[PDB]
Design an enzyme around this catalytic site. Sequence first.
Site, PDB file in Angstrom:
ATOM      1  N   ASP A 138      40.908  10.377  10.137  1.00 41.80           N
ATOM      2  CA  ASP A 138      41.628   9.227  10.679  1.00 41.80           C
ATOM      3  C   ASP A 138      41.294   8.002   9.852  1.00 41.80           C
ATOM      4  OD1 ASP A 138      42.564   7.064  12.713  1.00 41.80           O
ATOM      5  OD2 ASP A 138      42.944   8.947  13.784  1.00 41.80           O
ATOM      6  N   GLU A 146      53.356  18.139  11.967  1.00 41.68           N
ATOM      7  CA  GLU A 146      53.803  17.771  13.300  1.00 41.68           C
ATOM      8  C   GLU A 146      54.648  16.505  13.238  1.00 41.68           C
ATOM      9  OE1 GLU A 146      51.271  16.815  16.938  1.00 41.68           O
ATOM     10  OE2 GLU A 146      50.602  18.854  16.445  1.00 41.68           O
ATOM     11  N   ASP A 206      49.031  15.514  11.667  1.00 41.96           N
ATOM     12  CA  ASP A 206      49.509  14.797  12.841  1.00 41.96           C
ATOM     13  C   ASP A 206      49.102  13.324  12.719  1.00 41.96           C
ATOM     14  OD1 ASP A 206      50.742  14.367  15.251  1.00 41.96           O
ATOM     15  OD2 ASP A 206      48.986  14.876  16.455  1.00 41.96           O
ATOM     16  N   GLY A 227      44.745  12.916  11.703  1.00 38.81           N
ATOM     17  CA  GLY A 227      45.147  12.193  12.908  1.00 38.81           C
ATOM     18  C   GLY A 227      44.280  12.596  14.089  1.00 38.81           C
ATOM     19  N   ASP A 258      42.066   7.502   4.319  1.00 42.11           N
ATOM     20  CA  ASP A 258      43.516   7.366   4.281  1.00 42.11           C
ATOM     21  C   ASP A 258      44.178   8.652   3.785  1.00 42.11           C
ATOM     22  OD1 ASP A 258      46.171   6.552   4.008  1.00 42.11           O
ATOM     23  OD2 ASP A 258      45.700   4.847   2.717  1.00 42.11           O
ATOM     24  N   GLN A 259      45.032   9.248   4.619  1.00 42.33           N
ATOM     25  CA  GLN A 259      45.742  10.480   4.250  1.00 42.33           C
ATOM     26  C   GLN A 259      46.687  10.279   3.056  1.00 42.33           C
ATOM     27  OE1 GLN A 259      48.891  10.685   7.861  1.00 42.33           O
ATOM     28  NE2 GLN A 259      49.230  12.229   6.269  1.00 42.33           N
ATOM     29  N   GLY A 308      44.307   7.957  19.206  1.00 42.33           N
ATOM     30  CA  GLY A 308      43.785   6.722  19.784  1.00 42.33           C
ATOM     31  C   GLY A 308      44.037   5.478  18.958  1.00 42.33           C
ATOM     32  N   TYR A 309      44.435   5.671  17.703  1.00 42.76           N
ATOM     33  CA  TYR A 309      44.757   4.563  16.802  1.00 42.76           C
ATOM     34  C   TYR A 309      43.617   3.536  16.757  1.00 42.76           C
ATOM     35  CZ  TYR A 309      49.434   6.652  16.493  1.00 42.76           C
ATOM     36  OH  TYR A 309      50.501   7.502  16.261  1.00 42.76           O
ATOM     37  N   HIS A 334      52.676   9.843  10.351  1.00 39.26           N
ATOM     38  CA  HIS A 334      54.091  10.251  10.383  1.00 39.26           C
ATOM     39  C   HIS A 334      54.984   9.425   9.431  1.00 39.26           C
ATOM     40  CE1 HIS A 334      52.357  12.186  13.839  1.00 39.26           C
ATOM     41  NE2 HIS A 334      52.480  11.134  14.628  1.00 39.26           N
TER      42      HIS A 334
HETATM   43  N1  LIG Z   1      47.142   6.568   6.682  1.00 40.52           N
HETATM   44  C1  LIG Z   1      46.484   7.222   7.672  1.00 40.52           C
HETATM   45  N2  LIG Z   1      45.521   8.123   7.394  1.00 40.52           N
HETATM   46  C2  LIG Z   1      44.843   8.785   8.350  1.00 40.52           C
HETATM   47  N3  LIG Z   1      45.071   8.609   9.660  1.00 40.52           N
HETATM   48  C3  LIG Z   1      46.021   7.742  10.083  1.00 40.52           C
HETATM   49  C4  LIG Z   1      46.800   6.979   9.092  1.00 40.52           C
HETATM   50  N4  LIG Z   1      47.656   6.204   9.778  1.00 40.52           N
HETATM   51  C5  LIG Z   1      47.446   6.443  11.094  1.00 40.52           C
HETATM   52  N5  LIG Z   1      46.468   7.360  11.268  1.00 40.52           N
HETATM   53  C6  LIG Z   1      45.957   7.892  12.554  1.00 40.52           C
HETATM   54  O1  LIG Z   1      46.757   8.990  12.983  1.00 40.52           O
HETATM   55  C7  LIG Z   1      46.603   9.146  14.396  1.00 40.52           C
HETATM   56  C8  LIG Z   1      47.924   9.621  14.991  1.00 40.52           C
HETATM   57  S1  LIG Z   1      47.712  10.123  16.676  1.00 40.52           S
HETATM   58  C9  LIG Z   1      46.905  11.694  16.500  1.00 40.52           C
HETATM   59  C10 LIG Z   1      46.959  12.441  17.839  1.00 40.52           C
HETATM   60  C11 LIG Z   1      46.017  13.650  17.899  1.00 40.52           C
HETATM   61  N6  LIG Z   1      46.286  14.594  16.772  1.00 40.52           N
HETATM   62  C12 LIG Z   1      46.224  14.370  19.206  1.00 40.52           C
HETATM   63  O2  LIG Z   1      47.016  15.311  19.299  1.00 40.52           O
HETATM   64  O3  LIG Z   1      45.618  14.030  20.224  1.00 40.52           O
HETATM   65  C13 LIG Z   1      46.102   7.797  14.927  1.00 40.52           C
HETATM   66  O4  LIG Z   1      44.788   7.959  15.489  1.00 40.52           O
HETATM   67  C14 LIG Z   1      46.031   6.895  13.697  1.00 40.52           C
HETATM   68  O5  LIG Z   1      44.868   6.066  13.693  1.00 40.52           O
HETATM   69 MG   LIG Z   2      51.557  14.357  17.350  1.00 46.50          MG
END
Ligand SMILES: Nc1ncnc2c1ncn2[C@@H]1O[C@H](CSCC[C@H](N)C(=O)O)[C@@H](O)[C@H]1O
Ligand SMILES: [Mg+2]
Lengths: 393, 393, 394, 394
Positions: free
Chosen positions: C229, C298, C270, C199, C247-248, C202-203, C273
């Site tokens: 990400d 997290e 993170d 993670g 992809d996680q 910024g999505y 979720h």
């Molecule tokens: N299946 C997946 N695999 C990897 N990343 C993913 C995901 N689905 C969503 N995400 C990413 O997970 C992130 C969550 S926000 C992460 C916030 C960062 N750790 C901080 O503290 O500033 C987003 O950028 C989103 O693009």
């Molecule tokens: Mg978080």
Amino acid sequence: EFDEATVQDVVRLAGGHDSELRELTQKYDPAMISRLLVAEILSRCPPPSNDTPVLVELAIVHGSERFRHFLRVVRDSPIRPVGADEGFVGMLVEYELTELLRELFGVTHERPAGVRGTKLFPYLTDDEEAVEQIGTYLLAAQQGTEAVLAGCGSRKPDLSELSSRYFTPKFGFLHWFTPHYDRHFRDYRNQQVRVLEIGVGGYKHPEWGGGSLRMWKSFFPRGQIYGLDIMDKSHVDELRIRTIQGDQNDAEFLDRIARRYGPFDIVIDDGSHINAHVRTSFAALFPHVRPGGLYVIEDMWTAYWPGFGGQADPQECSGTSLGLLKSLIDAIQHQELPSDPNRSPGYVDRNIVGLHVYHNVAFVEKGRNDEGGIPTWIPRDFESLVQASSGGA
Amino acid sequence: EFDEATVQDVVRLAGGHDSELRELTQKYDPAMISRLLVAEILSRCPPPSNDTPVLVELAIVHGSERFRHFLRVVRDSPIRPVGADEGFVGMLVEYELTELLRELFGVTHERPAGVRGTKLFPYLTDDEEAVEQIGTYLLAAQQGTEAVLAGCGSRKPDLSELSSRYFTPKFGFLHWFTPHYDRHFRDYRNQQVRVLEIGVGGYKHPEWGGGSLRMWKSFFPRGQIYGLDIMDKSHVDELRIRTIQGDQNDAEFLDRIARRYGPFDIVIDDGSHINAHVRTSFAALFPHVRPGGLYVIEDMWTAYWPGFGGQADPQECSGTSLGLLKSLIDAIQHQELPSDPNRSPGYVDRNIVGLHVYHNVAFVEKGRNDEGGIPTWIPRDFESLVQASSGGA
Amino acid sequence: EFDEATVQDVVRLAGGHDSELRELTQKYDPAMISRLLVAEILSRCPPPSNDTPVLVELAIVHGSERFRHFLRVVRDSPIRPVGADEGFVGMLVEYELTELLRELFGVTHERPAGVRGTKLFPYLTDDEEAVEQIGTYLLAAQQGTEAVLAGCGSRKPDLSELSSRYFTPKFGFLHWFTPHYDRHFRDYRNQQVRVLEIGVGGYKHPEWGGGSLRMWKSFFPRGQIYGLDIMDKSHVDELRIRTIQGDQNDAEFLDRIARRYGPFDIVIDDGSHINAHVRTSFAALFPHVRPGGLYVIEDMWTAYWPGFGGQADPQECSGTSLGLLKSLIDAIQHQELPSDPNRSPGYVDRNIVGLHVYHNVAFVEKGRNDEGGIPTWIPRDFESLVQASSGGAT
Amino acid sequence: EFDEATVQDVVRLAGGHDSELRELTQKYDPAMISRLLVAEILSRCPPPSNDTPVLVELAIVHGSERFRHFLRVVRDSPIRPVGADEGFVGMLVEYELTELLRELFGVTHERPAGVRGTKLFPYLTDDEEAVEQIGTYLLAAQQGTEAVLAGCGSRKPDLSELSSRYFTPKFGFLHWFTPHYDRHFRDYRNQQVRVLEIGVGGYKHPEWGGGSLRMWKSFFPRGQIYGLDIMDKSHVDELRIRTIQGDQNDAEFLDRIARRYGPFDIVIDDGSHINAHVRTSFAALFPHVRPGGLYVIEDMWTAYWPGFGGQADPQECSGTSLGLLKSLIDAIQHQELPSDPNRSPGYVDRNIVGLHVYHNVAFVEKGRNDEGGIPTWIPRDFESLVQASSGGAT
Ligand SMILES: Nc1ncnc2c1ncn2[C@@H]1O[C@H](CSCC[C@H](N)C(=O)O)[C@@H](O)[C@H]1O
Ligand SMILES: [Mg+2]
Ligand SMILES: Nc1ncnc2c1ncn2[C@@H]1O[C@H](CSCC[C@H](N)C(=O)O)[C@@H](O)[C@H]1O
Ligand SMILES: Nc1ncnc2c1ncn2[C@@H]1O[C@H](CSCC[C@H](N)C(=O)O)[C@@H](O)[C@H]1O
Ligand SMILES: Nc1ncnc2c1ncn2[C@@H]1O[C@H](CSCC[C@H](N)C(=O)O)[C@@H](O)[C@H]1O
Ligand SMILES: [Mg+2]
Ligand SMILES: [Mg+2]
Ligand SMILES: [Mg+2]
């Protein structure tokens, strides 16, 4: 604002266990204690980083009472209390009075959670306009809260940073003292220290001075800071900082203030830098440093300059601050002198246990210097020592 | 030997500044305080390593008075006071009363020198047979002195070594607890802690038990230790250790002792290990843990055993100590539950801020659990969250 | 310019003794090492507080060579290398190359003096024009120097402050994580850690994200940071920070990147979720955490929300992140289970030695869980235990 | 058996990350590494406290190999390896080779669990004969294991206690040095230090000496210790401790060994205590102390005694160790001297940044002393300074 004896008593009790915290809140009006803690918090808060102004509500609870304080937080302005209607409340921070006492003035371990309650956007009613309010204030509310919470705890600050924040030349350009001050002072921070600094700053200018006093106040969360200056500096006085007008070269004056306000855990000479004054103040005030305490001399560069009573020749140091520091080596070693019934160790001899010298700053450790000299049955020449130590080989 | 309230008051004032130390020595007979400090020192000293028996004279000075104690020091015997004529005096150790109070019970920085005076071979007259006396006693006097001085300070001990020294199974064979205890407890050591351990040890045996209480007394120099056991353990009581006879499964009893002796910085359950008892004691005593304090449960292995009220199936844990620990995870997270006006958070919900689980030992952090749940304007499904967080992209 | 394998090698050698520092400066071109150190310094510097722009000259010396860098320092701007003539030089800071290596990337004690040389107003001519120049630049030069010097060392930062500085929500409003991170992470700071955070942030926004990666880079002076990400985050990459797109929830992909970049001292989830995702990533990545390392999860709040694959009923947790955490308690305790010939302890059972749970953040300690269960000769009922422990007393 | 270059290389790699640990166990024979680690462990173990003799089996695992070492543990004897049949095995301790390397010689955080496996009474048959064996060996096995495990880690020892244990007079009777040594040395404990002490001990006695060298070895888990003595002290040599025979008053010899074995993080003079010798050794060896290192002088008491080349009058100090220390104050302050074109700062002037003096022990901090003297535009008299600092106020 607050009586010094009261503040010191509050700090003394806040350092205790549950019974002392209860004693404190019984002895004094909780409303008054609340105002005292807010005064401390306002001085403790770091500079805000948020561009958009926000309010942080601090509510202090004791029994059935709730003391509400609305703090305006914005970059390039000090945090100050305002009316509830004077901005957007980004955060409500709730402390129990006894918990805030522990966090500011307690003898406590680091507590990573559980010291407070927090309610974000506490008065934002959930309607159509809320989303707009959220976009405008989300970042500023996080930044503003972080600044206020930093002022509600006792986390160790960076002395080099405080030095720059408070406009004192201890670090960054002319001098590089703060790493040494940090190493020598950091272990005292959970103690109710009395610190005396000679030299408040600003000289004759009616508004200037006090930066290093502010620095020690910030560094020692349970401390009382005293500043001595020949010029009036009463504009510097605030919670936990008292200034005193007088001459560091007046030993009678030094006696009176040391017996009135001491004994001192730390004495610092950052005054006139006249060599005779450095020596006079040390002779007068070293007896009033606590055992385990420190006497610090700043700016020994003046030892080499006639205009400060110094001498260009480093060997001609009988009347200089460096001559004093050199003599302190013999004072430390005094028990090693050959016996003389006509000679008695002096006060300093008996009471110095360490000397630390860095560029333009020296630290003297006060303590009982009574370890014992090398006994008479250890030989006083090399060959005899070798023979005595070789077991007949 | 000494009144518990007096000892606690002595420790409380010893933690203060010069004015509190002066108050202490005015309030109590200096001779009595001297005996109190000697009693503490005798329990604090490590095992002597010297084969040849020596005396170390400890002289405690206050005003015109000098309280002299001759301590016999020899390997495989506890250090104890004797008559002046009962051996060779290898060392005279001199403390000012207020300085020794600071060193044992004070809130103090580490002081590498200057806390005492030392006079080696203090009564050895320099005649012809001194050489003989020096050869016999030089090493033993060094070793004996090192042991006594270790008992005159507040250096942090090794919990693992204390566990072997005091015959408790916290480390070395069945269990490996002490590094976790050290990590969780070490930050509390300059506080006047009240520690309650359920389970003194020794069960029905008339002489056994108390090893872990001695361990906590050693670890917490300013602490008061309480030990609860269903069996009488009054033979364990000493300075700073009180035992109480009663049943940990008796909630009325737990109320009374908690309100009599609390609140507690630390509570440890090392009792019956009956699952119902673990849960009963936790419910009754968690409210009496101080905010910022710890509740510890030892020996959760019994969660799996019917003979302790446990269950062989780890999923059938509604009545076990592990079921309790699992439920504490939801308590920590309770503010994240969807809203329900018919549901009120319970006491534990509102008062747990951390859970630490290791093999057969768990640590629960007491504090205000009121950080705020995720606000309603954060979307409750992934896609909606992504869209809300992407700024229109 | 700076190859990842090269940076890691520089950090590895910088952590050594004199022989390793000499090896480093013989193996690589000193001019390149100098540029690499300046790149690091620029990212380490705190925000400047001076209103009046100044220059701080940083001269890095090695042998007969002197690498001069003129750094522009002014409030509300990043510290940037400029030409010598582009402002007033308030201070000359001199470092020997091997000394600067030790200070930034070494395993070293705190050195309160003696690591550098400083020459104030180094090009100010002593004449009638000096006094006005001194008046104009004295405070600015002090504040400018402080910011640069802070970037030339390895002092531990305040994680809570970095959260506001790097715009990550780890502390201050929604969450209060940083004091826990500090307690669990600070003991790793002199190690050459490999940190993976799932993670980046910024999505779908093309510019946003990376704040927490910056935070870990600042916290771990000898570290290599990795960020995973599902979206492209290549704009976040800088010295000691690499982002990976993937992809996680793809276990085979996770094993591939873990083999390529691990083993990790620290993994942090993170990410999405989504409950199933948290569980997939944990199973796949826990084996790639080093013994003595940490797996962090997290935002367990989503465990209660069906929109993230959670359940409103906390007892219905078989598929949630909280169900996983609860199960880790039994994993820790697994050697205490009654004997069963056809039951064998799983990987997680054998490799978890600690669990720490706080509000919306949990830390799992990776290590060998092999202390031994309670021996069969300790009685399995209370009354028999009393008897066996009482030495014949009745 | 163990080559010094090899030992130092093992320590150097053990301080790295996973790649360095893998490199180590590929570069050297794992069986040899295991013997090396056992030799280290034996010196680290505290004195055993158990009256009943027990065996602790230490099994070191690497790949498909298992190196088994049976350690005899009993009070008043050093722990030593014996045959498997030479006693009752109270405990089996299992370490993976790379984990034991990290624990003994690594740059590592404190790990309260998960570093090893433990199997109590590993060969005790579960039958009618067990209960008596348990009764006899339960306490002894616990205390025995505790001693061995303490030797398998890198916990900081108590220097004052070690002084009594290794029979050196640093603390307890004549001297009270160890608290100062602890304060000044403890921050170096993570580093692969090179420590030179002048004065091994024992003088002309064929067996005596070496206690303080053992102390430093125990205190610095990654260190190499060197001991200089005018007498042969070859019987003191062990893993990580090398003695050198020679005269501290021979400057050319000192430079030779410093080039061969340096640079040193720490040099300690506890030698002849002849004043000329202290001064000669300092001049010769201070250039060979690392920046950030320490030069320590013990027993300055001899400064006052003509039998050691001293003087009874403390003012007559031009040739004494105390005269040297006093002069170091001016060296620290040298940049404050008024300008002189024919005068040039000496080596010591340029390289001292701190001085610490206690009773009979002094610590000199080696570093670049180049902060800059007070600028010419700061007034050189009090009254002018008042005026310049008062912003026009009279
Ligand atoms: N299946 C997946 N695999 C990897 N990343 C993913 C995901 N689905 C969503 N995400 C990413 O997970 C992130 C969550 S926000 C992460 C916030 C960062 N750790 C901080 O503290 O500033 C987003 O950028 C989103 O693009
Ligand atoms: Mg978080
Ligand atoms: N004889 C004397 N006694 C006391 N103070 C004196 C003095 N002569 C000068 N001073 C004061 O000593 C101060 C020196 S400047 C002190 C700076 C301050 N410590 C800081 O770091 O911020 C001046 O304010 C001056 O007025
Ligand atoms: N219901 C109950 N209430 C209180 N104590 C109990 C109890 N049942 C058993 N005990 C006591 O709990 C103790 C367990 S052993 C405690 C060992 C001790 N903590 C140590 O580490 O050394 C026994 O002394 C036993 O008498
Ligand atoms: N000129 C010289 N050069 C080197 N060593 C010398 C010397 N003259 C004497 N010595 C040695 O210095 C030693 C002083 S005793 C050292 C004690 C040791 N450091 C400890 O603490 O236990 C003696 O062993 C003596 O042989
Ligand atoms: Mg000054
Ligand atoms: Mg137990
Ligand atoms: Mg010596």
